[PDB]
C-alpha cells in the first residue's frame, strides 16, 4: 500500500546517513560572555561547598552508628597537621571566594525568578555587583 | 541508475509561501490527503518580507462600500484586469479577513476593538471622486510575517504532509493533461514520484533574472518554467513592476507606507515633486507613474547623490512617535544596509524590480488555461490549477495596486479549494501509467550534474542579469528592445557547455543554483520577446516610440510558447474579460484616460 | 557506565511527526520549584544571622540552620543527576545513581545528631576548621 | 591595490564521511566586496571554490536561514558585518551542538518536531453573531509585543547549555516564548492544557537562568524574560 511503503522505504536510506553524521563544536569555541561564566561559577562553588558538608557529616554519621566517638577538637586537630602552613591557607583562601560568590549569587537568583531585574541591562548590571561583592566579602573573611 | 519513491495523493501543492498554504489546510479540512511540497521551511518564503496591509472594506474607520474598493483596482490597472475577477476579489475581501483574524493573526487595534486601518496610495472613496480612504487592516510593519506565522501554524491543526526541503523538477503529463509532480530531495538525494489527481503550482514571481530586485534568492520563476516546458502557454510576461523606493547598490526595500503618512521625494535641489517636471498634481500615485517620475529626474539633469543617480525620501518631518508605533521594522533596515537612521537625515532610493504581473493564465475560479490552437478560444487544461504570485488571473493587469497581492493569496488561495471540492470526489483510484513516467526529467538531472565545460554557472547569471537591465527596463523603445531579444538569445546559447564542479547528491547547492538558472532563462527569453511586440504605452510597460494607449487594437493579452532553451517562442493573443460576474449586483466599468 | 542504544541521528521520522509530550506529573514539576524556593529563602536570611553573630549559635538557631541546609544541598546534586546521568543515556543507572542520595544522605541527618547534641552545631564545627 | 583578508570555514562532505571536519581557508579581497558575511560568503562561491553550501533567502534578516556561528557567537550572516582589518582572520562554524548535514547546514529536525507540540494556533471555542472579528483592547494588544516577531532562527535554542546535552526533551527558549505567545493572548480560551504538558521533569524546568539567550537573539527579542513568566504562572494557580 504506497504511502505506507514508501514510508518505510524513505527511513531506511535516511537513517543510514544520519548515523554518519557529525556534532559541531560547544564549548571551545563559543565566546566567553558574562552570562554564562557567572552562572557556571554558581554550580561549580555549590558542588564543592556541598561535597565538604556531606564529607563532614558522614565522618560525624558513621561515628554514630558505628561507635567511634568523634568530637570536634578529634578531628579539628587531625586537619592543623597533614598539611604545610601555606596550603591551609590555600584552603582557607579558596573556599572563603566561594562562599562570597555563592551568597551574593542567591540573592541575585532570587529578584530573578520574582520576574524581576531579567532584561539585558539588569542582567549586566547585577553581575558587576556580584563581581564586586565577592572581592569585599571573601577578604573580609580571611581577616577574621 | 537512481532510485525513485513512489507517492500517490489527491491533491499536491507546490510551494509554501501564503497562498500554497492557504490552499493547503482548505483542502485538508474538507477531506482530502494533500501534500504541500515545499523547498524552503514554509515561514522562510518571500511573503513573510511584506512590510504593507491586507485591503478590505470593512468599514471601522469610516463608511465603505465595496464596489468602491473595485474601482480603484481596475481603473488602477489600465482596464486590462479581467473584471470578473475583480468582483470576486473584492466582494469576497470583508469575509476573508474576519476569518483571518479568527485563526490567531494579532492585528492592530482601535479604541472599541476593532482592526486598525491606514492609507495607501492608489484607493480612494466615492468612486474615484473624493477623499483618500482607509482600507489596509494591517499589523504594524509585519503584516506577511504575522500572516506566514499563523497560517503554518492552521496548517499544523488539519493533516496537511509537509515535504519540506524538495526541489520539484518538472511535471508529468500524459495527452495533454497532468498528473503530478517529479521532485528531488535535497537531504539524502532521492528522485520522488507524486501521482495526483490535481496539482496546484504556487511558487511566487521571478525577480532575480534582473540585475539589482527586491526579490529574494530563492525568489526565481520555478513553476512558470515547469509549465511551459510541458508546452502551455505563459501570459502578459511583458509587465513588471518598477518600485519607487528602494536601497542603492544591494536591492533592500523600504516600505510603500513611507511615503504613506507623510513622505517627500527630495531631489538635488530639495522641492517636493508635484508638477514642473515629470508628475500630475497628487502625490503618492500608483508605481508607474511615480517610478516613471524618478528615472526621468537624474537623466535629465537633476543628478542627486554621488554618481548622479540617487533619490532622498525625507522623514525628519514626521513625530518619533510614528516611526516607533506605525513602522519600526524600517527604522532598523535602513542603517544596516545603508548606514543611515531614519530621524533626521534622508535615507538612500533607487528604483528596483518589484513585482511580476505575468505567470499561468488562470480562471477566476482557479483552473488553468490554455487556447485551441485552431479556433483561438479558452479551453482548460485538466488537473491543473494556480494560484499567488505565479498565476495570472489578471486581477492586477498591468500595475498592481498597493497592499493588493497580499490578497490575492489569501482569497484566491481559497478559491482554489472551493472547486476542487465541488468537482472531484475524495478517493479514487489512479490509472496505471508506464513505468518510465518522468524519465526526461532524470537524463537532464543527470546532464548538469556531470557537466564539464567553460563557463561556470555563476558567469552566465551575470550575463543574463545585466542584459535585462540594460535593455527591459522603465524606459524602453524599439531598438534597444530589439537588441534585448538578441543578446538573450546569444547567452542562452552558452547554456549548452555550462561548468559544474560538485557531483554529490547531499545537499549538492550546485546542482539546484544551475536548476534555478535554467528555470530563469526560459521566463526572461519570454519577458523580451513579448515586450517587443506590444507597439502601446499602458501599465508598468512604457514605449518612447508608442507613448499612447491604445484601447481599440491592444486589449489583449499575449501568450508565449517555449518547449526549452534555445527553442524559438512564438506569441497569440487573447481576450481581455470586460464584464462581471452578476451585472445587478455592481456594472462593469467603461474605460476612460 | 551502560549506554542504552540512542536514537539514530538524533531525530527519528519525519518533521511532522510531533513531539509527544509526557504526562502532567506536578509533583516533580511545579511542587518541585517549590522547595528549591523554600530551601532557598531560609538559608541566606540564617547564614546572614551567622556571620554578625561573634560566639557559635544557639541549638535551636543551628538544628533549624543544619536541616535547610541539607535539602539546599540535595535538591542541587538532584538538578546534576538530571541534566548528567539522565534516563535516556544511562536508563536504570539515573535510579541507582538517585538512590545514593537517598540511604548515602539519609545517614547524614543521624550526623546532625551528632552534632546539635554532643557538640555545639555545624557553625561551630566550621568555625573551630578556622575559616 | 587589494586588501585580503582571511576567511576560515568549517567543512565537512558527506560522500566521503570517513575523513574528520576541518577548516578551510579562503582569502577574500575586501575591496570588491560587499559589508555583510553572507556578500562575502556568496563571493566564495562564484570566484572559487563552488562546493561550500550554506542557507540564505531575503539579504535582510526577517526570515532566519542563515544563522550560523560567526566569530565566537550566533547570528545571521545578512547583517553581521566585517570587520575591515586585513590583520584579523575570521572563523565561521554551524550552529553549536547539532549534527551538521554538509558544511554549514545542520539538522533543524527535532526544532520543528518540538514547536508543533506545543499546539501554535487560536483555540477558542464561541465566535460573534454578526460576522465581525472578536474584540481585543488596546493595552491587551501590547502584550504581545516582542513575542509574535520571532522568526525561528534557533539562535537563542543552540547557545543554550542546557539544551545542549537534553534537546530530545528539553524545548529549548525558542519554542517556549512560542507558548507564552499563546498564554497570554487574551482570545485563546483554552490555557489550562497548555499549562499541563510543561508540568513535568523535563519540559520547562530544565531552564538554570544561564541567559545566552537573551544575549545572542538579532533580532533584539528576550527569551529569557518569558520562560521565567511561565514558571511564575504554573506556580500561583
Ligand atoms: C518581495 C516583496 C514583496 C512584497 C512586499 C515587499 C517585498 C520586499 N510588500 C508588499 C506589500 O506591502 N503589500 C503587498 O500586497 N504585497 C507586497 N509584496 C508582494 C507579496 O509579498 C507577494 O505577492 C507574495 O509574497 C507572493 O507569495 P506567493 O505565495 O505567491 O510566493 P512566495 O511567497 O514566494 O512563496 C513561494 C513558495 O514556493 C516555494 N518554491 C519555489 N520554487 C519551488 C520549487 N521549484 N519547488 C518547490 N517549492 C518551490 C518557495 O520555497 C516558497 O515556499
Ligand atoms: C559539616 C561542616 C563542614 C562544612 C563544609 C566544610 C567547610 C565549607 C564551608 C563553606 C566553605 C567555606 C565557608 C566558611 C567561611 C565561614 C567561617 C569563617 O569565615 O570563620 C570566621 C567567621 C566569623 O567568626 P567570628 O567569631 O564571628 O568573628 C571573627 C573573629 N573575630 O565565622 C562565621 O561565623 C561565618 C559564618 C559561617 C558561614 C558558612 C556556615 C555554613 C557553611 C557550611 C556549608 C555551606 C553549604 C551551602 C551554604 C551556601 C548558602 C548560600
Ligand atoms: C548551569 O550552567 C551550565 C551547565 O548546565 C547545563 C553545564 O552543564 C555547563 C557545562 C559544565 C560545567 C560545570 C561548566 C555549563 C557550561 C554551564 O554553564
Ligand atoms: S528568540 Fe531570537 S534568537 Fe531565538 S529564534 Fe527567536 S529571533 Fe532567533
Ligand atoms: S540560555 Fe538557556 S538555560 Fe535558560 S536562561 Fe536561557 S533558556
Ligand atoms: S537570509 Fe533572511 S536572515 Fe539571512
Redesign the pocket.
Known amino acids: 500500500e504506497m504511502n505506507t511503503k514508501a514510508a518505510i522505504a524513505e527511513e531506511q536510506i535516511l537513517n543510514k546517513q544520519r548515523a554518519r553524521r557529525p556534532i559541531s563544536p560547544h564549548?571551545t569555541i563559543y565566546q566567553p560572555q558574562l552570562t554564562?561564566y557567572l552562572?557556571?561559577f554558581?554550580?561549580?562553588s555549590l558542588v564543592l561547598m556541598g561535597l565538604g558538608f556531606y564529607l563532614f557529616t558522614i565522618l560525624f554519621g558513621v561515628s554514630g552508628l558505628l561507635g567511634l566517638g568523634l568530637t570536634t577538637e578529634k578531628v579539628s586537630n587531625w586537619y592543623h597537621q597533614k598539611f604545610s602552613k601555606i596550603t591551609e591557607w590555600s584552603i582557607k583562601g579558596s573556599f572563603a571566594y566561594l562562599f562570597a560568590i555563592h551568597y551574593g549569587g542567591a540573592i541575585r537568583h532570587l529578584i530573578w525568578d520574582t520576574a524581576k531585574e531579567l532584561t539585558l541591562k539588569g542582567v549586566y548590571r547585577t553581575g558587576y555587583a556580584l563581581i564586586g561583592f565577592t572581592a569585599v566579602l571573601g577578604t573580609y573573611l580571611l581577616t577574621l | 541508475k537512481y532510485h525513485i519513491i513512489d507517492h500517490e495523493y489527491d491533491c499536491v501543492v507546490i510551494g509554501a509561501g501564503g497562498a500554497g498554504l492557504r490552499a493547503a489546510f482548505g483542502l485538508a479540512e474538507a477531506g482530502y490527503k494533500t501534500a504541500c511540497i515545499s523547498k524552503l521551511f514554509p515561514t522562510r518564503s518571500h511573503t513573510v518580507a511584506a512590510q504593507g496591509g491586507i485591503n478590505a472594506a470593512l468599514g471601522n474607520m469610516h463608511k465603505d462600500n465595496w464596489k468602491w474598493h473595485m474601482y480603484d483596482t481596475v481603473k488602477g490597472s489600465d482596464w486590462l484586469g479581467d473584471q470578473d475577477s475583480i468582483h470576486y476579489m473584492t466582494r469576497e475581501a470583508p469575509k476573508s479577513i474576519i476569518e483571518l483574524e479568527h485563526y490567531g493573526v494579532p492585528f492592530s487595534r482601535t479604541e472599541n476593538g476593532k482592526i486598525y486601518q491606514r492609507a495607501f496610495g492608489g484607493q480612494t472613496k466615492e468612486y474615484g471622486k473624493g477623499a483618500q480612504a482607509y482600507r489596509t487592516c494591517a499589523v504594524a510593519d509585519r503584516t506577511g510575517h504575522a500572516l506566514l506565522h499563523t497560517l503554518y501554524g492552521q496548517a499544523l491543526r488539519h493533516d496537511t504532509h509537509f515535504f519540506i526541503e524538495y526541489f520539484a523538477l518538472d511535471l508529468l503529463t500524459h495527452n495533454g493533461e497532468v498528473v503530478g509532480v517529479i521532485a528531488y530531495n535535497q537531504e539524502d538525494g532521492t528522485i520522488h514520484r507524486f501521482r495526483a489527481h490535481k496539482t496546484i503550482i504556487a511558487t511566487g514571481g521571478y525577480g532575480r533574472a534582473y540585475f539589482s530586485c527586491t526579490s529574494a534568492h530563492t525568489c526565481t520563476g520555478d513553476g512558470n518554467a515547469m509549465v511551459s516546458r510541458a508546452g502551455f502557454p505563459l501570459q502578459d510576461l511583458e509587465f513588471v513592476q518598477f518600485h519607487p523606493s528602494g536601497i542603492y547598490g544591494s536591492g533592500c526595500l523600504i516600505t510603500e507606507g513611507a511615503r504613506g503618512e507623510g513622505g517627500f521625494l527630495v531631489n538635488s535641489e530639495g522641492e517636493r515633486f508635484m508638477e514642473r517636471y515629470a508628475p500630475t498634481a497628487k502625490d503618492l500615485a500608483c508605481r508607474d507613474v511615480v517610478s516613471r517620475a524618478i528615472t526621468m529626474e537624474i537623466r535629465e539633469g537633476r543628478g542627486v547623490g554621488k554618481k548622479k543617480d540617487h533619490m532622498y525620501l525625507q522623514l525628519s518631518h514626521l513625530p518619533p512617535e510614528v516611526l516607533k508605533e506605525r513602522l519600526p521594522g524600517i527604522s532598523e533596515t535602513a542603517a544596516i544596509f545603508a548606514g543611515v537612521d531614519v530621524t533626521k537625515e534622508p535615507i538612500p532610493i533607487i528604483p528596483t524590480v518589484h513585482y511580476n504581473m505575468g505567470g499561468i493564465p488562470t480562471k477566476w475560479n482557479g483552473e488553468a488555461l490554455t487556447i485551441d490552437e485552431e479556433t483561438g478560444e479558452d479551453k482548460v487544461i485538466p488537473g491543473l490549477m494556480a494560484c499567488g504570485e505565479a498565476a495570472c488571473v489578471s486581477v492586477h493587469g498591468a500595475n498592481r495596486l498597493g497592499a493588493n497581492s497580499l490578497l490575492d493569496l489569501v482569497v484566491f488561495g481559497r478559491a482554489v479549494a472551493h472547486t476542487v471540492a465541488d468537482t472531484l470526489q475524495p478517493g479514487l483510484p489512479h490509472k496505471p501509467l508506464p513505468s518510465d513516467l518522468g524519465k526526461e526529467s532524470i537524463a537532464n538531472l543527470d546532464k548538469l550534474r556531470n557537466a564539464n565545460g567553460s563557463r561556470s554557472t555563476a558567469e552566465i547569471r551575470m550575463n543574463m542579469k545585466q542584459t535585462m537591465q540594460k535593455d527591459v527596463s522603465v524606459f524602453r523603445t524599439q531598438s534597444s528592445l530589439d537588441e534585448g531579444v538578441r543578446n538573450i538569445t546569444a547567452v542562452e546559447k552558452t547554456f549548452d557547455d555550462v561548468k559544474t564542479t560538485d557531483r554529490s547528491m547531499i545537499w549538492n547547492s550546485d546542482l539546484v543554483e544551475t536548476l534555478e538558472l535554467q528555470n530563469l532563462l526560459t521566463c526572461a527569453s519570454q519577458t523580451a520577446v513579448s515586450a517587443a511586440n506590444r507597439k502601446e504605452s499602458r501599465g508598468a510597460h512604457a514605449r518612447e516610440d508608442y507613448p499612447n494607449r491604445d484601447d481599440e487594437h491592444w486589449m489583449k493579452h499575449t501568450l508565449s510558447w517555449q518547449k526549452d532553451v534555445a527553442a524559438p517562442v512564438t506569441l497569440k493573443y487573447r481576450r481581455v474579460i470586460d464584464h462581471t460576474l452578476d451585472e445587478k449586483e455592481c456594472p462593469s466599468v467603461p474605460p476612460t484616460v | 557506565l551502560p549506554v542504552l542504544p540512542q536514537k539514530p541521528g538524533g531525530v527519528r521520522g519525519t518533521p511532522n511527526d510531533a513531539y509527544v509530550p509526557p504526562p502532567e506529573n506536578k509533583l516533580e514539576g511545579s511542587y518541585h520549584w517549590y522547595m528549591e524556593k523554600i530551601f532557598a529563602l531560609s538559608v541566606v536570611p540564617l547564614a546572614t544571622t551567622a556571620m554578625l553573630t561573634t560566639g557559635p549559635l544557639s541549638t535551636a538557631a543551628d538544628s533549624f540552620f543544619s536541616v535547610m541546609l541539607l535539602g539546599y544541598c540535595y535538591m542541587e546534586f538532584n538538578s546534576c543527576i538530571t541534566?548528567?546521568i539522565s534516563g535516556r543515556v544511562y536508563g536504570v543507572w539515573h535510579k541507582y545513581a538517585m538512590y545514593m542520595l537517598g540511604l548515602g544522605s539519609a545517614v547524614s541527618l543521624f550526623g546532625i545528631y551528632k552534632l546539635e547534641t554532643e557538640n555545639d552545631g555545624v557553625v561551630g564545627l566550621v568555625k573551630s576548621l578556622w575559616d | 591595490t587589494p586588501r585580503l583578508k582571511t576567511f576560515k570555514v568549517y567543512r565537512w562532505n558527506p560522500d566521503e564521511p570517513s575523513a574528520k571536519p576541518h577548516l578551510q581557508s579562503y582569502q577574500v579581497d575586501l575591496n570588491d566586496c560587499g559589508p555583510m558575511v553572507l556578500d562575502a560568503l556568496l563571493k566564495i562561491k562564484d570566484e572559487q571554490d563552488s562546493t561550500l553550501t550554506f542557507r540564505r533567502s531575503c539579504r535582510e534578516g526577517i526570515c532566519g536561514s542563515c544563522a550560523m556561528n560567526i566569530g565566537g557567537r550566533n547570528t545571521l550572516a545578512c547583517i553581521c558585518k566585517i570587520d575591515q582589518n586585513e590583520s584579523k582572520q575570521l572563523k565561521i562554524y554551524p550552529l553549536p551542538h547539532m549534527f551538521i548535514v554538509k558544511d554549514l547546514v545542520p539538522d533543524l529536525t527535532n526544532f520543528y518536531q518540538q514547536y508543533k507540540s506545543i499546539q501554535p494556533y487560536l483555540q477558542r471555542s464561541s465566535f460573534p453573531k454578526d460576522g465581525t472579528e472578536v474584540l481585543q483592547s488596546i493595552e491587551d494588544r501590547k502584550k504581545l509585543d516582542g513575542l509574535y516577531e520571532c522568526i525561528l532562527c534557533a539562535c537563542c535554542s543552540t547557545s543554550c547549555?542546557?539544551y545542549?546535552?537534553n534537546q530530545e526533551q528539553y524545548l529549548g527558549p525558542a519554542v517556549l516564548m512560542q507558548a507564552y505567545r499563546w498564554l497570554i493572548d487574551s482570545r485563546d480560551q483554552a490555557t489550562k492544557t497548555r499549562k499541563a504538558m510543561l508540568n513535568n521533569s523535563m519540559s520547562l524546568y530544565r531552564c538554570?537562568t544561564?541567559m545566552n539567550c537573551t544575549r545572542t537573539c538579532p533580532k533584539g527579542l528576550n527569551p529569557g524574560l518569558a520562560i521565567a513568566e511561565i514558571k511564575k504562572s504554573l506556580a500561583f494557580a
Open positions: 564549548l554564562w552562572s557556571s554558581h554550580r561549580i | 541534566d548528567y | 547549555p542546557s545542549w546535552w538554570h544561564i
